[PDB]
Every structure is written in C-alpha cells, then in structure tokens.
Ligand binder design. Sequence first.
Ligand SMILES: [Mg+2]
Ligand SMILES: [Mg+2]
Ligand SMILES: [Mg+2]
Ligand SMILES: [Mg+2]
Ligand SMILES: [Mg+2]
Ligand SMILES: [Mg+2]
Ligand SMILES: [Mg+2]
Ligand SMILES: [Mg+2]
Ligand SMILES: [Mg+2]
Ligand SMILES: [Mg+2]
Ligand SMILES: [Mg+2]
Ligand SMILES: [Mg+2]
Ligand SMILES: [Mg+2]
Ligand SMILES: [Mg+2]
Ligand SMILES: [Mg+2]
Ligand SMILES: [Mg+2]
Ligand SMILES: [Mg+2]
Ligand SMILES: [Mg+2]
Ligand SMILES: [Mg+2]
Ligand SMILES: [Mg+2]
Ligand SMILES: [Mg+2]
Ligand SMILES: [Mg+2]
Ligand SMILES: [Mg+2]
Ligand SMILES: [Mg+2]
Ligand SMILES: [Mg+2]
Ligand SMILES: [Mg+2]
Ligand SMILES: [Mg+2]
Ligand SMILES: [Mg+2]
Ligand SMILES: [Mg+2]
Ligand SMILES: [Mg+2]
Ligand SMILES: [Mg+2]
Ligand SMILES: [Mg+2]
Ligand SMILES: [Mg+2]
Ligand SMILES: [Mg+2]
Ligand SMILES: [Mg+2]
Ligand SMILES: [Mg+2]
Lengths: 185, 258, 184
Amino acid sequence: PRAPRTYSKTYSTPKRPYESSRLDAELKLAGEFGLKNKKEIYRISFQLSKIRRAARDLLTRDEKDPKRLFEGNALIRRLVRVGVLSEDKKKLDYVLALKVEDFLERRLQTQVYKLGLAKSVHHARVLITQRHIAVGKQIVNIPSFMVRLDSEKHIDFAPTSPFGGARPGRVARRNAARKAEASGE
Amino acid sequence: ARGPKKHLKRLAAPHHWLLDKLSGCYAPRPSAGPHKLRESLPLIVFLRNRLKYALNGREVKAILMQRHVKVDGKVRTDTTYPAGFMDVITLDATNENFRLVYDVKGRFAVHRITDEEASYKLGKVKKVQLGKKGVPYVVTHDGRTIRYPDPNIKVNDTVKIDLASGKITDFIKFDAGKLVYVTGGRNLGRIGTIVHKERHDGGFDLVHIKDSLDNTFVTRLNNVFVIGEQGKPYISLPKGKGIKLSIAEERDRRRAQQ
Amino acid sequence: GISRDSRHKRSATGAKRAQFRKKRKFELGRQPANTKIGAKRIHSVRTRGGNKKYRALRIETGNFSWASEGISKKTRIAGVVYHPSNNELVRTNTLTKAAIVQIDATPFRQWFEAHYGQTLGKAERKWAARAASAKIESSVESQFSAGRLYACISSRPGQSGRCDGYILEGEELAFYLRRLTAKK
RNA sequence: CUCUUAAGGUAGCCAAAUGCCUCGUCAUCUAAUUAGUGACGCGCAUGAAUGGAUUAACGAGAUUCCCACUGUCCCUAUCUA
RNA sequence: UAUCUGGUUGAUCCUGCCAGUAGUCAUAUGCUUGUCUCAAAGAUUAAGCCAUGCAUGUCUAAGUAUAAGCAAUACAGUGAAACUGCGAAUGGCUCAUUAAAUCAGUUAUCGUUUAUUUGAUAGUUCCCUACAUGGUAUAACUGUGGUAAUUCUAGAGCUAAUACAUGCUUAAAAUCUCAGAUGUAUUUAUUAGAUUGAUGAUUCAUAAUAACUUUUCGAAUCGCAUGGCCUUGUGCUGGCGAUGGUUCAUUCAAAUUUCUGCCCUAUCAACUUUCGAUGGUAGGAUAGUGGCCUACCAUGGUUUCAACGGGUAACGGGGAAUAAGGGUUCGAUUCCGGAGAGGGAGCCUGAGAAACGGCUACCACAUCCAAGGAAGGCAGCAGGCGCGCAAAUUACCCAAUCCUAAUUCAGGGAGGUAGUGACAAUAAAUAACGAUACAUGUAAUUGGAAUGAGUACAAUGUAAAUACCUUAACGAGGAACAAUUGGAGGGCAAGUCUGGUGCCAGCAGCCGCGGUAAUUCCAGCUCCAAUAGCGUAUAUUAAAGUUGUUGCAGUUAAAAAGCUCGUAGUUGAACUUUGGGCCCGGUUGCAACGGGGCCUUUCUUUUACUUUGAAAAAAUUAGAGUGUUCAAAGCAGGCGUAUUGCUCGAAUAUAUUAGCAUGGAAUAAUAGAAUAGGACG
RNA sequence: ACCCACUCGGCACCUUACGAGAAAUCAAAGUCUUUGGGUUCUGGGGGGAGUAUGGUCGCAAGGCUGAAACUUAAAGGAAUUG
RNA sequence: GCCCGUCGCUAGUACCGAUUGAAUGGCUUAGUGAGGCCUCAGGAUCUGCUAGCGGAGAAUUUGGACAAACUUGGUCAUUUAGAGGAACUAAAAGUCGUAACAAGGUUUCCGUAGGUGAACCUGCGGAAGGAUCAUU
Ligand SMILES: [Mg+2]
Ligand SMILES: [Mg+2]
Ligand SMILES: [Mg+2]
Ligand SMILES: [Mg+2]
Ligand SMILES: [Mg+2]
Ligand SMILES: [Mg+2]
Ligand SMILES: [Mg+2]
Ligand SMILES: [Mg+2]
Ligand SMILES: [Mg+2]
Ligand SMILES: [Mg+2]
Ligand SMILES: [Mg+2]
Ligand SMILES: [Mg+2]
Ligand SMILES: [Mg+2]
Ligand SMILES: [Mg+2]
Ligand SMILES: [Mg+2]
Ligand SMILES: [Mg+2]
Ligand SMILES: [Mg+2]
Ligand SMILES: [Mg+2]
Ligand SMILES: [Mg+2]
Ligand SMILES: [Mg+2]
Ligand SMILES: [Mg+2]
Ligand SMILES: [Mg+2]
Ligand SMILES: [Mg+2]
Ligand SMILES: [Mg+2]
Ligand SMILES: [Mg+2]
Ligand SMILES: [Mg+2]
Ligand SMILES: [Mg+2]
Ligand SMILES: [Mg+2]
Ligand SMILES: [Mg+2]
Ligand SMILES: [Mg+2]
Ligand SMILES: [Mg+2]
Ligand SMILES: [Mg+2]
Ligand SMILES: [Mg+2]
Ligand SMILES: [Mg+2]
Ligand SMILES: [Mg+2]
Ligand SMILES: [Mg+2]
C-alpha cells in the first residue's frame, strides 16, 4: 500500500476539567478574541507548549553551540516574522515568557478588528468566514491565519465579497427587485 | 524467498533519489547493470525527476525508444537502466552531456559537461587479476574489464577510460596528496586530498581526507574515488566541489541573495 | 528428501529444536551412487544452477597416474582391496574416493618398456639419455611380476563420473601394504 | 425438655463373610445386572486386643470387570488307541 | 505539561488501598451528526468453511506463417490458432507455527550457486553437403470419433524452427612425441607460481606436463541497407544491428555464517548421548562448509552467569501510546526480514520453488454425476456463511506508480479511482450590524445588509467520472436552514427553585441520597462543562515515590529468615611520576580556558571504562526552509514576461546494546624477578 | 580486697536531642527529596489463606514451598477528648 | 457499646471424589505403511543399420533412503462429567450461647497436644502487644 499519511493533533485538553479560575480565564480569552470554543485556546496553548519545550531544550545547551544557535535563531525568526515575539526580544529567553494572548493577537480575526475593517471581533469573524477579507491577492476565509507582520499592511477587502469591489451583493439584488415592484411599476 | 525480487516499494528506494512519498506504492527498481542497486540512478529518475523533460514513465519510455538517450556511448533503451557514478548521459536532441556525480548533499547532481570531455570517464580499479590465457585485466567501479593494463596499476587507483575504444589512456595512483571523491557514507559527495591511509589488515582500511577548507574527515577505503591531484581534477567538479559547509554557513549563503 | 539442514540435529546444548521452514530444496541431499566395477553406466543428475553431476555406477576403467614419472595411463580397475571408511565397500567392490584398488598395470609396464627398456616385469640413445636412474622401487616393481598395481582413487565417482587415481608409492605404499597384511 | 443407666457405643466402619425390611437409596459398570464397585446411614443386631480402621507383599481362599484365548456354547462333525 | 482530590475518625496525624482525573493511529457501543481536507477498515473469536466472477500472461523490424483470415510470380503488410522463447519463484494476503528459532545491528564466503543486465572473451572442430544435413517430428491445420460430465483427449494425412539431432570451412605462425598432437569444457596426478602478479593469509589467480571423458563450447539463426573491387559470375570482399553461446568479471540475488542482544516460569535442576549427542579420521551427499548422512574411534557437549523443560490470548524489528528524568505498556497491521497457503509429506520443470490461482499421495472437509467417473484449495480482490463486542462494493480503470513478456503497443482486483465509513486526524456554519423603549445590558418594539448548507447552467477536475476549488440563476427572520451529549451535594463547574414519589421507584465510579421539609430519584424552569461532538464498557499509560536503578517500606500500619556456617553471586583497606620550570601555541573577551615540545635521575601483559569517527535503510520523531487560503499535511517552490528561461531546495540531529577505528591512562581488575630457570652484552 | 583516674571490650541505664519519626518513641529507629559505604532476606489494601494442588521432608503429628476463583471499602497504626 | 463461633435458609465460587471417567492436542516405543525420487530389472511398439545390431522407449518390477497416514500402547498437557464429601464468600433483625475489647468478670496472645454443640476449655514452655518500667 501507499506510504502512511502523517497527522498530528493540534491541541491538548487541560488535566483538570473543572478548575474555575482556568474556566474564567478561558472564557475571558474567548470573549475578547471572539473564539468559537475552548479548542482554539487549547490549540494555542499546545503550540506555546511545543515552542516552550523547544526553547527549553535549546537553553539547556551551552551557549554558541551550533545546534542551539541555529534552531534558536530559526525559532526567533519565525516568531518575530509572525509577530508574536517583539522585535526587542530576540534573545530566546523572552520566547519562554510568551503568552497565549501574544498568539491570539496575531490572529486574522484579531487583526481585521484592530485594523478597523470590523466593528467587533465577532464581526471580523463572520466577515472572514464569509470570504469578505483578503490578505494579499488571496481570499482567506479562516480566522486563524497568523498574519506575517507584512500582510498586515495588506489586509483589505476582496475584489469580490462586496465591501471592497464592484458587485452589489446577493440580498441587495432581491431587495431591489422587490422595491421596484413595490414602487408601483 | 523463492527467487529474486522484481518490485521496489516506495520508502525502500534509496533516499538520494528524492522520490515523492505519495506518488505511488512503488519506486523504479534499478535493473541489473554496471554499478549497483543502491548506488545507481535509474534513467527514468534522471529524466522525470532530475531533468523534468518527461512527465510520466510512459514519456520516459517514449524518450528512450527513439535512441535519444545514451549512457557511456551506448543507447541503453532500458527504462530503469542503473546509471551511476561518472556515467555520461548524452542526448542528441537537446545536445548536452551530464556526468553523474555526487553533490555536497550526496545526491546525484545534474552536472552539465561539454562534448570535448564527455568522451572519457573515470573508473576506480576494483581489482587487478590475471584472466584466461595469462592476460591481465582490471575491473573498475562500473563493472568494466580492461585487458592488458599498465603493470603499475594497483587496487584503489583510478583509470581514465576512453569510453569510445573502451581502453585505458591514463591512470592515477592512490597516494597522499591526490584529489579524491567520497562515493558513500556520511561524507558522500565530498572532495578532498588524501592525508594518510591507515591499513587495518583484516579489517577495513581507513583514509583521511582534507578538503580545501582544511576540514579533515576519515572514511572507509571502500567509498573513496581518486579524481586527480590537488587543484587539477581530471573531471569537471560540481557546483560546490564537495566543501560541506555547515548549516549556518549554508543559511548565510542562502540569505546572501536579497 | 535427504536434508542437510541443521534445523534437525539438535543443538549443542542438547535442546530439541522446534520445526520451522519445512524442508527447502536448496538443502536437499541425494543417495550414494555406490559405484560398482564393470559395464560403465553413468547417469546425469541435474544439480543446482542448471549444472550437471555424473553418477558413475559400475565403472570399469579409470585414469591412474604413476606420479613418479607423470604418465597417467588409462587402465582397467580389477577390484577393491582396502577402504579406510568401511570394509563393506571392499566386500561389495564399491568404487569411491580414497579406496585402494588394483589396476591392470599393463599400460604402465608397456610405457616403462617403451621409455626405458629395462625389463620391469617381463630412438636408440633416448634410453641412454633416460639413464641408469631408471629403477622405480622394489615394491612398485614387484607388483609388475603379478601385473596388478595398488592404486588410490582420487576422484569422486558419484560426483564427477570418473574413477581416476594414483599409484601408491613410498610411505603410502608401505602403510597400505601393512594394513593389507594386518587384515589379510 | 423430660424419663432414665454402671456407662448410655467414643475414634472409626458399614446393606460389609455382620442390615430383617431388602433385589434399601444414589452413582458407576451393561442393551439389559437380586452380581461387582464407590457413596449414604435413627446401624433388626457395626465398633475398638470378645480387638477397631487400614495395609505393601504373599494366597491351589471368596468375588466383579477387561484384554488375549479357545468346541463352554451357536452346532455339531471328524480322526487315533 | 516535575500538580493531585474524595472515602476508615466524635475529631487528628499516618499506612494503605478503593474511587475520582487526563491521554490512548485503542477496541467496542449509545446518543447526536451541517461543512472542507485527510482515509483506518473481518487482526483479536475461527491459519474456521466457502457459491460465483476476476486476480498471469506475453510478439518486435529482427525464431517458426500456404488460417482454404483479412485486406489494393514466395509470402515480404496486418494478423487467429499453434510450435518456440520468456515469465508465471515477482506481486498481493495472513501471522498459524516459531523463544537463541525468527529478527536487529554487525561479520565471512581463502566455504558456494547465480537466469537476467553490463563488460570482456573462443583463427586449433574435421577420418566425400557447407552455395548449408536429417525426420530419426510434430504441433496448429484437415478429417473420423468416444465420454453425462473437466483447460479429457485417440486413431489417420501433412507441414517448419534460434524446437530435436547431427554436422565443415579459419590459412599463416607456433612447441614437444616418434607423420601426430598441443583451443576450450571435465577429472586426476605432478610442476612453477620466488625475493615471475595479488591477498593480512592460501594448495589463490594464472601458466605448464602427462593423460581421461554415458562427452561439453567453439551460431547450419534473424531483420534493415545494400556498398565497393573485379576475371561482370550462383564472382570476391565489406555495414549497422537482433538473437544465441563457453569462460571470467559485474549486477540482481541466493545459501550458509562471526559476535551480541529476546517475555513469564524452579509447583522445570540437571539436560544431551541405545535411535548423532560433542569431537577426530575417511567416505557419501550437497552448489558448496559442516554429524548433513554413513563406517570406525574417543567420551565428550550444555548448565544456578538458569541449561533442559513448561507457558505465551508470542511472528521479530523500524516503530506506537504515555511520558520532568528514569521508566511502563503495546507493535496481527502501509516499510524490512521470516514463515504459510486446510494439516502433513514427496517431487517435476526451472537460474531460482520443496511453488500450492504446479503436480502426487495420505488425513479432514467438500463439489458434479447418466453412479461408470471427474474435479478441489479466497490467510489475492470483491462477495457469502459461521464466529462473535468487533470490521466496507460480488463497482470503474490501466490515466499515475511501477512490474512482467518476444516487449513503446498486451496484461496486471499489483495499483489507482469512486461507493460504504463519527477508526483516527486538520480547518471551523448554526449568525453579524443598526434604529427605537427601559435600567453597557435587557424586552418575539423594527430595519437594511452578508454568506454558505444546499440546488444547478457551463467550465475545471478526471480514463469516464464523482467530489474539491471557481461560479450564471435560485438559496434566511422563529434567519423552523431550530446542536447535541452528560451534569448541577462533595470530588468537580453549575439551584438550599417548583411539582412528584416517600428506604418505594430509583440515583449513586467512591463518599453517599431517598423511610412526607429530597440542593442527589422522576420531571418543568434555570444554570454548568465540552461541543459536531459528548457519554458508557474494557484494556493500557501518567497520576504510582502503590514495583522505588533514579526512588519505596520492614519496632508498633504488610514485611528482618529462630540461630550460625557456607558455595555461587555481589562487594572489598592503603601505597608505585608527583611537583617543579621554560617555550610554541588554539578558542572567548593584554586576561581566562583549553593542547603540544623539551629537560628536571624520565624518549609496545590482559581487560573494563571513557573521547572522537565510520556505522546503526527509508518511513516515523525532533527540526531548517517553504502563505497547502490557515492547519493537519506535502516537498514543494520562487522571480521579471508575451520569454523560445533563470534559479534556490527536498538540510541537520537522534539511536551508544553489540561489533569497528581512535585519543586518554584517573578509577576498578589483571601479570611480571624469590629454590631467580630474572633483565641488558 | 578496696579507693581514685584513664583505657579497651560488654550487658544496660539517665538527660538532651543538632537529628529522625505518623506518633508512641529512637544514640539509633540519626548522618534520607541536600535522596547512593557493602550485602542477604522479606512486604505491596483487608479476606479467601498459609487454604487447595503439586513437590519434598517426617513413623505420625506435621514442617518447607504455595496459588487461584471469589469477595470486600475499608481493615490497620499511633495519638486526642469523652 | 462493640462483638465471636457452631447450627438453619437462599445465592455464588472453588476444592476432594469411585467411575482402570470422557474429549482434544503434542511427543513417542512397536507394527503396518500410500506416494514421489534414486536404483536392480523389464520390454509394449517406434524407428534406423546390415535372420542378426544398435538407439528411443510405456506398462510393470527389485532394493533403498525420504516418508504422509493408520493401528496399538505409553506419556505429557489442556478442557470437561460425576453419586457423595468438605469448605469459603454475600445477604442477613433466623436459632444457641457470650469467646474477645474494662483485670470483659478465668488478663490476653503465641507454639504444641488433648477434649468439648458452638464460640472455646485445659496441660506444658514462651511473650507483654499487661493489669507491674519500682523494695540497696
Ligand atoms: Mg458413632
Ligand atoms: Mg449397615
Ligand atoms: Mg458397598
Ligand atoms: Mg456378569
Ligand atoms: Mg463383635
Ligand atoms: Mg502356603
Ligand atoms: Mg483508578
Ligand atoms: Mg482471523
Ligand atoms: Mg512475496
Ligand atoms: Mg587452483
Ligand atoms: Mg568430510
Ligand atoms: Mg511481541
Ligand atoms: Mg501466534
Ligand atoms: Mg509486526
Ligand atoms: Mg493472533
Ligand atoms: Mg511483509
Ligand atoms: Mg512458500
Ligand atoms: Mg481457510
Ligand atoms: Mg506445497
Ligand atoms: Mg488461491
Ligand atoms: Mg502464489
Ligand atoms: Mg480478501
Ligand atoms: Mg443547526
Ligand atoms: Mg461548499
Ligand atoms: Mg434535577
Ligand atoms: Mg462547586
Ligand atoms: Mg508503600
Ligand atoms: Mg498486629
Ligand atoms: Mg506488622
Ligand atoms: Mg563466595
Ligand atoms: Mg581500593
Ligand atoms: Mg494484600
Ligand atoms: Mg489504636
Ligand atoms: Mg467474656
Ligand atoms: Mg465466666
Ligand atoms: Mg477473659
């Protein structure tokens, strides 16, 4: 048969299901960032834990070690490119001190709201899901996109999806066709 | 198990072919031939994955059927002909010649050469034996036998092969200070000079190689290929000349084009 | 058939081995040829690789070498007089490697007369050149009076189909005559 | 609880060569068993040197079953003195 | 992400387990189920039994064509059948057997076979054809049939070969025998093979002499072009190939093989050796080594450092889950190796099979029969029965991947595609925004926008599709286009709400609730948790420092043998070159840390250990780069145009058992010279 | 023989514990999460059960070795107050 | 207050058990032994060469080794029936007594032996886990 297909889980559930403080913090994050459920928070914390483990294993190595240098520089480059890690924190010790909100901020659902394209995080969510937002010349209909700190200056409405283009929509068409008859002629 | 295997499942093919994981269940099994199964490079791989001229194995067969491809002077219409080290692939249509050599990463690099030097090839002398009727001969790395060799040619030497008359024109000996290619192991694809040869009678002979960057590595005698003297290779070396830059320096060279 | 594997033939510790890999063709054995004397009957056995072996049964003639002068005459084998491995092969007159047989010796006597001209057992100066260093031995020549030479089979009749050999000499002859006179 | 004895049969064992009822009841053995064996025991009337229980070996002792074997029989016939 | 909590008590601190908790490519099962990608899937119980259909055939220019087959002066094209050759020993499936067996890593073949590929290689053949031999040969074909029945085949008449069997031409030169022989293949003997090739090492390669073969090889083959010279003749020479062929080498392989490493068990301590067990000699057999087998001989071989025996619901490994570290558990299963095709055994062909979609017999099943007989092997693909807690279509296709063949063309249930599919995994619809009233929120007080879930012109995708992307039109107000699964005493987030029942019905993993005041049952409302998922059962992992090497406990909670001796095992006091010093010199900032060279009385026992290097397949893991739209993934891809194109990549680390190479000489062991049989001349 | 002082070895004792322990208490039951001097044996919740079975020893009584099914949320230790 | 055992009922689990019990599988002594292979033969009829002499050769057949399988018996292992026997556990408001916890009213407990409906009693030696750390 053909080679196995690799696949991995992208989240991890909490050890304690019913910790009230964790539940309140998770609900705060979901309300602030307009998240669908706790699985998005779980995914972000899982990614943060993977990054933290990598940075820890690198930090246990001696300084100026070839592997530590290469992999830590690559991880710092990726994090600053995605904009999760600030430009003044390229040390690999502030990587460990990263938080869930740092990743949640670089979300396309967060960035569309922070760029004024939407009135709320939920408005940004529905606008993205409805193909109304284009990152470059490409429609991105997924709230989790991790804008790369250079597409941020390019997040605009799509040529389709009639908030940044020519067409007047689909419900406006039927509304006009009904208003023309309701006018009398 | 009851006879020789004729299939080659994917993920069992040599990794230096850089085959797709999910293209199919099977990989092109190198037919019997001059070099090896592992150390070879099927013409279908060289034509559909390294040159991108053909898109399918059917197109590879179509290319091969019209005598277009030529390996070491002969047509070699075999779809999975085991082309290997120092073999010369020449196509009369799209007339350029490649000498199959190892890049720094140990893959068979696409190395265009000229017609004026595609005529010859190099070959490591695998053995020196007396054949029938007392006629001495040499067996080379590519399974070639050459009768009446120079009486000074020993094992681990290299012989230039005309590849038109199929005869020895020149020979390089194995000695300290000679340019050598690494044809296997971790250092596969590196190029350097012989520093010393530790004997290890009974076991495996070890040879120390020093590249032009003064990096010194030891490797088994089985996978070293003399290619000349330092600064004068008898063949055209690939783009990297077997330097084995570290990963950091490779990243720097990659980022030096912005 | 006959198996040469070590899956039977219990281990050196004495443990009985369980049976895996039911008998394989590449491990096969075959039955002895048990080469007899007279009325040559050689059969071809198709062996591994498409090769061929020759089971010689009932062999009457063989190529025997003197090895003192290098003649290697073809002769008739009379019988088996000694066998280091089994006296039953002597009793049944079975031809096999290392068997002590008696050969006709008349081609060797004829060669000796036509080469030296020295009346072993009863072109002019060639015999003079083959000079007085012509006596062979007091035990190799005393057999010529009876016209039978003790020889040792050197080929494997069941393997090659031939029953070649060499005429015993020196300490080998002395040892084999001592064995013969001890057992007869 | 009574009546009652010198003591009221203990340890054991049993339809046993000791149990009437009785061809006792259950199981096994068999197609079929008043037989045999193993169990049960309010045991007419088992039981401790009137020795109790069990025992390897032994037995021209009594008994049941199985294999072999065969005129014991089916079913008789023939031969010798 | 190195975490605990509830339960023994009137209360306390412990031991200690039960219970809770989270994960599981880990199996079921319940409820629910809208979208995209990805796709496990009759392994567990039965390697149990199988109806039916398919899964291995194959032709070029180049083996054989008189099809009475097609087509417009031998056929010359195509081409049925057949002969011939090759393949059918690959693949795919399954895990039953198997515990030093397989397997893994690592060795050897100076101990062997090797179809095929690639390269090289053969002037030596004959005791009245070579301008080319025979049927001793026949198939298909033609015709006559038998049988109820099978891929049954009989008699008769042809016909060919790269089928079968014979059979010459190659001078020239050349060395021995007394005119002949000396090629190569086989067998034996002998010689050289040095210090005239090679290896660490050979009786190696090779050569030579003498001979020997139920006798090999040394093209009586085929296609396309036909050229040149000349006495123009059936003249003489000369191309490119195909096929075949002896030997060597090579490759694909195979077969043995070195060393080390397997789970539980002593309620297995002795095992093997009569009937080979350990070794020697010789023979036989093998492709070859070898007690592989035989004859003789010897009494050996293994074992508490666990042999041998027994169990495994044991194929081994790469790996998987969980994991602070150490570990624990799993691995039938996408790759590698092994084994098997109902159980055995035997064997033909073939290079390669002890083959099973090959044969033969037995055993067990079981099929058709006209009862005479004949035919069987789904642990291949579908599919059926049975077994069960437990697992899908009797679909399409060779378009990719490759494989096979005479080979570009044909074949392939290999494979791919789709159907079934909440195995598992990735992304994330069920609404968003205003106006108005009340106190940012609320009340079915209203509005205009947006979209895909669907359906569908076309198009893309595809072998044909289907689905995905992209979209003409349609396709929201209860946006009814209505999200569920378990809970609300504690653990553990969420009610002392209302009705019901009243130690009943029931809940409750545990503690417990319910006996008329139920925060626990049955319901309504509300609320909680996760969410297209949630619960339940079993197993396993962490929690478990409740298996403890790290790292447990033993006075009283379970546990110090009644006591001493003592073998194996484990462990074992100290000591032998240290310290001066002068130089050369690398890495991080003149200083530190790291090496080497000299003296200072100083220039090849045995191991363990440790450093570095090769090694440990790929896939998987970690990890670099890369906008699959993100992501799981994949190894892609990227950049200026109207090109007649330039280019980066598919790294790196990891296995430290065992073997190999190498530096060191602390630590631990080992031996030197004592009746000197000692060290240097 | 006795006294004084020291010393080695021994049966123990008193106080205090830096320390240890759950505590009772302990100069070891200390030098243990700052966990490693060497070594032997034993235990893994309570019952079933030191039972059944097998082996072995004994004249016997019994000794040594020694399960499982099943069942249970406690059993137990020290201490406090009644 | 707590509490122990016999006995009686119900349910479940395991054990012993006559039956020279039964079934399955492994191994194996002995006996028989298919089949192919090698081998000693054998000669349908088939064709070549001069009544002869060679070659190919089916049926059949000798002896071997390889050996399935069967029968007999033995042994091992795993399941399983069984009259009867003898325990354990759960549920318990059943019957009898009160053995232990207070000096539990005979201090308790251990080893051993005997006895008794039952817990238990008694003898011998031991322990304090005793109800005594104590009479220079
Ligand atoms: Mg009585
Ligand atoms: Mg009685
Ligand atoms: Mg009786
Ligand atoms: Mg009777
Ligand atoms: Mg009496
Ligand atoms: Mg008597
Ligand atoms: Mg638990
Ligand atoms: Mg199955
Ligand atoms: Mg296979
Ligand atoms: Mg030789
Ligand atoms: Mg031998
Ligand atoms: Mg396993
Ligand atoms: Mg198994
Ligand atoms: Mg496996
Ligand atoms: Mg299984
Ligand atoms: Mg496999
Ligand atoms: Mg097989
Ligand atoms: Mg089956
Ligand atoms: Mg078979
Ligand atoms: Mg089949
Ligand atoms: Mg098959
Ligand atoms: Mg199937
Ligand atoms: Mg809905
Ligand atoms: Mg859609
Ligand atoms: Mg409720
Ligand atoms: Mg709460
Ligand atoms: Mg503990
Ligand atoms: Mg106690
Ligand atoms: Mg205790
Ligand atoms: Mg000792
Ligand atoms: Mg020491
Ligand atoms: Mg316990
Ligand atoms: Mg107490
Ligand atoms: Mg009392
Ligand atoms: Mg009293
Ligand atoms: Mg009392």
